[PDB]
Amino acid sequence: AAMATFTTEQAGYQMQAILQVIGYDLLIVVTGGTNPHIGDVTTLTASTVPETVKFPSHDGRFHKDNFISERMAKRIQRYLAGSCTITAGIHVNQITKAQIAAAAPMTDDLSRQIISWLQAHPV
Amino acid sequence: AAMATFTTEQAGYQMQAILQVIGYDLLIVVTGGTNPHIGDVTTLTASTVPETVKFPSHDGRFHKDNFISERMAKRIQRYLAGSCTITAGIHVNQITKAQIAAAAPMTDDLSRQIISWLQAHPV
Ligand code: NA
Ligand code: NA
Ligand code: NA
Ligand code: NA
């Protein structure tokens, strides 16, 4: 199983997804960088359009939005047996353009591990 | 601390809140009864109006909505240092009127333990 942890690291920083199964429903906590937080929450089922809450900036200043919980939700949506809630909060102090670019492949890498896990542990 | 678990039991069924601190942000997972699930997600900060996602019924049939994540959010809102996400999913097979009535005091009981914990462990 009811809990699993997935990690990836590209361009020198790590992202992590912690998955918890509750009933037929999923909770996925996505964090990364030096300052993990909860900046976005995406909710969905297999058959509804995902929706995303965006909290005010965890440190007040402006950071580019990489759409991480939305991107993960799109990848895993068709594998869901019930509801799904994805939090995301990645922060790298003085992030570089290459590290920004790595956010999308790293999210897909976590998504692929999650999908494999769900297929191995049907709920 | 960064993680704590709170429980209550009234009228013969248990509710549980698992709290995880990520940065300055909170994730609270509220479950109970025989069939824990994620049926509602409430998001808020100290200064914004809470909003609640309601997923389709975890078992297809109609159950009364006890507004659990909303009720907890109202109780703890003024103590938040950052963002807060509360999932809730309580199910008792053939719930009784007394057990339905117990949902509100039990949510307040979990909320009071959470507030005490936050005051003892400032983030
Ligand atoms: Na691993
Ligand atoms: Na944001
Ligand atoms: Na306790
Ligand atoms: Na509901």
Swiss-Prot record, chains A, B:
It comes from the Bacteria. Disruption phenotype: Cells lacking this gene are able to decarboxylate gallic acid and protocatechuic acid. InterPro entries: LpdD-like_chaperone-like (IPR048844). Belongs to the CinA family. Probably involved in tannin degradation, however the precise biochemical function in metabolism of gallate is unknown. Gallate decarboxylase does not form a complex composed of Lpdc, LpdB and LpdD. The term subunit has been used in reference to the three-gene operon. Gallate decarboxylase LpdC is the only protein required to yield the gallate decarboxylase activity. This is Protein LpdD. The gene is lpdD.
